[PDB]
């Protein structure tokens, strides 16, 4: 099974540097070229560079020559890309892929495999952990048949946060809405519709993790006692 796994969400101060990573598995690392892409807003999808792990030979898009640098680790089957002297212009999502193209002569295309992506935020602002608030219904009862629960992840920076219910053991029916930047600070929420069979009895926990601040919050959604 071919899998490409990338590094986590980086938050970097301008002028510094970061090194992203793409760990391969399932295929023979050194026999294929690995391409790296940039998906920015406005700019939108640019080809950065590529590397052949077998020979260590690289190729760089002229536009990123001197900004990005590629390398590879044969033993671990992990390719790296380094971004130097970061700027606001460098904030985007970077991808890595086993494109599958051979040579102008073979003209053969092996199935492409893409990594998940890595959000990189070039900023000076201070990191702020989110405030999780467990939102439960009430009154003449709400959501009759299926009940919807919710979680409000308020006032954090930067993105992203990783909301999940019962640590992934509750996947069907979850809804997560995009964070909207208000006062230089984000806010997002998520809902989970579970049948009434497991609401009153049977625990439900909203778990939010904030990578940029090494934070984890577990909020047991509780009913109203008033």
């Amino acid at each position: 099974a071919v899998k490409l796994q990338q590094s986590g969400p980086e938050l970097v101060r301008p002028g510094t540097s970061v090194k992203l990573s793409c760990k391969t598995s399932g295929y023979i690392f050194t026999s294929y070229w690995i391409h790296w892409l940039k998906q920015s807003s406005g700019q939108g999808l640019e080809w950065i560079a590529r590397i052949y792990p077998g020979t260590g030979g690289t190729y760089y898009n002229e536009k990123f020559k001197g900004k990005a640098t590629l390398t590879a680790d044969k033993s671990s089957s992990t390719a790296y890309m380094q971004l130097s002297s970061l700027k606001s212009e460098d904030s985007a999502v970077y991808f890595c892929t086993r494109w599958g193209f051979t040579t102008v002569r073979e003209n053969y295309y092996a199935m492409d495999y893409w990594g998940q992506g890595t959000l990189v935020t070039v900023s000076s602002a201070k990191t702020t952990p989110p405030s999780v608030y467990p939102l439960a219904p009430g009154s003449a009862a709400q959501t009759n048949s299926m009940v919807t629960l919710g979680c409000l992840v308020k006032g954090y920076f930067p993105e992203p946060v990783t909301v999940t219910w019962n640590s992934g053991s509750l996947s069907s029916g979850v809804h997560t809405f995009p964070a909207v930047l208000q006062s230089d600070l984000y806010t997002l929420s998520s809902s989970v519709t579970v049948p009434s069979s497991p609401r009153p009895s049977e625990t439900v926990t909203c778990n939010v993790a904030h990578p940029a601040s090494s934070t984890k919050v577990d909020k047991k959604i509780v009913p109203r006692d008033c």
């Binding site: 892409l37 939108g44 999808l45 640019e46 080809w47 898009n61 002229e62 536009k63 991808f95 892929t97 599958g100 193209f101 102008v104 002569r105 003209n107 295309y109 199935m111 492409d112 893409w114 990594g115 998940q116 992506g117 405030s131 608030y133 467990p134 939102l135 439960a136 219904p137 009430g138 009154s139 709400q142 959501t143 919807t148 919710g150 409000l152 308020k154 809804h175 997560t176 809405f177 995009p178 909207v180 208000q182 806010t187 997002l188 929420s189 809902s191 109203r224 008033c226």
Partner: protein, 219 residues
């Protein structure tokens, strides 16, 4: 180098109907070997891009017989005969004939679906939040079509109060509805002065039905 230009910017298609994304290029894409390196990528909501067609007309393993790659010279075309709900995404075209490989700007596909009324859910502020002096009353409106819907907040029988913030999701590429979350954020003071809070939803136009509400104190 090389400029790929896509059109339309976005497009709505009623499931079953066809669609034609266009990609014009700034130079010729024919290589010495007589080959034209033009590919078409997808990228569905929340996923990475994926190759669909390589060498102008070669469907990849797994691609449906409904997709058609075409073109000649500088004009290229991707045709979808029967649009299915799962084709939701932002199609991109990449030229590979000239070194700095370049992409198009993408064309966003939107599956036109039949109208569907939402399911409203309103939530009172958490006591935990109230101890910090703020109050966010949340209302989840989900599983609806079309997109743009009108949500109304009526505090203590009257209009809005203390500013609302809204957020929709991507269309579900399985079914084809939407989901939105409307958050009313008042301070602790304002919340503690009114007692009835409502969330009405107007399906495009008219007098807003689909109302959910709670009563402060009596909760």
């Amino acid at each position: 180098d090389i400029v790929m230009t896509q059109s339309p910017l976005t497009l709505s298609v009623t499931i079953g109907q066809p669609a034609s994304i266009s990609c014009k290029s700034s130079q010729s894409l024919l290589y010495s070997n007589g080959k034209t390196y033009l590919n078409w990528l997808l990228q569905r909501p929340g996923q990475s891009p994926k190759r669909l067609i390589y060498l102008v007309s070669k469907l990849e393993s797994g691609v449906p017989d409904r997709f058609t790659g075409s073109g000649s010279g500088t004009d290229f075309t991707l045709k979808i005969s029967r649009v299915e709900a799962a084709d939701l995404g932002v199609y991109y075209c990449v030229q590979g004939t000239h070194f700095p490989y370049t992409f198009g700007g993408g064309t966003k596909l939107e599956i036109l679906r039949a109208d569907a009324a939402p399911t409203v859910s309103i939530f009172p502020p958490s006591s935990e939040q109230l101890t910090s002096g703020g109050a966010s009353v949340v209302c989840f409106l989900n599983n609806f079509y079309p997109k743009d819907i009108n949500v109304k907040w009526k505090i203590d029988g009257s209009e809005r109060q203390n500013g609302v913030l809204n957020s929709w999701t991507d269309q579900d590429s399985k079914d084809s509805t939407y989901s939105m979350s409307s958050t009313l954020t008042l301070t602790k003071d304002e919340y503690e002065r009114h007692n009835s809070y409502t969330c009405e939803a107007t399906h495009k136009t008219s007098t807003s039905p689909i109302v959910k509400s709670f009563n402060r104190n009596e909760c």
